[model samples]
Target: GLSDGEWQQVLNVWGKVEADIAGHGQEVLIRLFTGHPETLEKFDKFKHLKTEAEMKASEDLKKHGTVVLTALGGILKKKGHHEAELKPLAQSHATKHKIPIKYLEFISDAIIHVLHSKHPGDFGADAQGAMTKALELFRNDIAAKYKELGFQ
Candidate 1:
């Protein structure tokens, strides 16, 4: 559990900046796909976007970004408690979607990177640490299920 201060810090930073939903989301997803372009293949909608610009330009970028941010917001809203509430997320990613749930780690990395860039030195390490902890919890739960189910 994070201190109330840490949780508030996380909320303050994300609550304000994440409203530029499309840009922030695109920044995060772009970082993920740019590094592992092949990972884009998992999204039938995004797979054909061979380049970063094309992917970024797709109208769906904002929608997807909002979705990601919403999940993070929900968890953060809970102060990082009640992580099991995300089990449906794990189930969807591992079973329903069939995308390598493991790739979510890169998405988390991208988000943290974007948050850092948005806040610069103002993004305190403690807040980032709490956020990362939340992200990793979901990732581990989903990734474990994916691997357990024989996903590569």
Candidate 2:
């Protein structure tokens, strides 16, 4: 768990990160796919897009990216109490989507890359530290959910 001061620091900078959810979120997804194109097979909704242009122009991509960003915002605002908000999402990804738990770390890296590269001031060391910890916590929580569901 993060310290009280760390939570405050994360929340304080979250507004800027939340401002352009679709734009930043889209970039995050793009980066993830670009870095690991094979990961695209995990998304049945996105698997048909053969190129980066197709990936960027797809409405479904944007909408799903926004959903992911908003989910992260919701989890962040809850401080350390995120199981209720995270469990169902994890379960769906594990069972219905069949996405591996390790992909969460790839997504986490993409998120940090977006924050650090796009908004350096908003995601300075203090906020980055807190956010990194938060993402790790979330990943761990989701891993636990996957374990509970008997998913790898």
Candidate 3:
């Protein structure tokens, strides 16, 4: 577990790395960061919306809506907590730019997967290894994605 100071440091590094990546004109990191929060809040909000929407819908619509809500809820709930926080922001940006939501999902999943894989042990040397690996993987992925997006 990170101490308060360490957590702040982590956030600082993340903010700087993100800023540097953004300077190159790549927006992928921003989308990923944005989606991280939205997924959680949106999923919570969606739960409420689903109930409300169901009440006003036709029987047929309610049945299909249930299926859609269930699927979305399952996936969002399974997403990592940190990543879920960014979902609403990602959705808003996607709507504004006509970008696909799948991109945000893909990036967020990739990040969580890499972190979980590297940090499986959760403490001591294993913890350190996992954290190191996660940072390296995140940095590399962001750099690669930026390049792919045509950012220098």
Model 2 over residues 75-126: C-alpha lDDT tens digits? Answer: 9899989879998889898999888877889989888898878886757788
Put down candidate 3 lDDT per residue, 1-152, tens digits, no spaces.
33444444444333333333222112222223344533323333233333323323334433433443233333333322323433433344444433344454455454444334433543234434433444443334434444444443
RMSD of each: 2.4, 1.4, 15.8
Alpha carbon lDDT of each predicted model: 0.74, 0.86, 0.37
- The best candidate by lDDT is 2
Instruction: Report the CA-based lDDT of candidate 1 relative to the real structure.
Output: 0.74
Could you give candidate 1's per-residue lDDT for residues 1-152 as a string of tens digits?
Answer: 45777667777777755668667887787888888786777788787888877877887976887787777677667765644756677677777777676588778888788888776897678878867776776577667667677775
* Predicted model with the maximum TM-score: 2
- Residue 60's lDDT in candidate 3: 42
Error of 2 at 123 (Å): 2.0
Q: Which regions in candidate 3 have their CA more than 4 angstroms from the true location?
A: 1-9, 15-19, 23-91, 98-100, 109-152
22: Cα error in model 2, Å: 0.4
lDDT of 1 at 40: 77
Candidate rank order under TM-score: 2, 1, 3
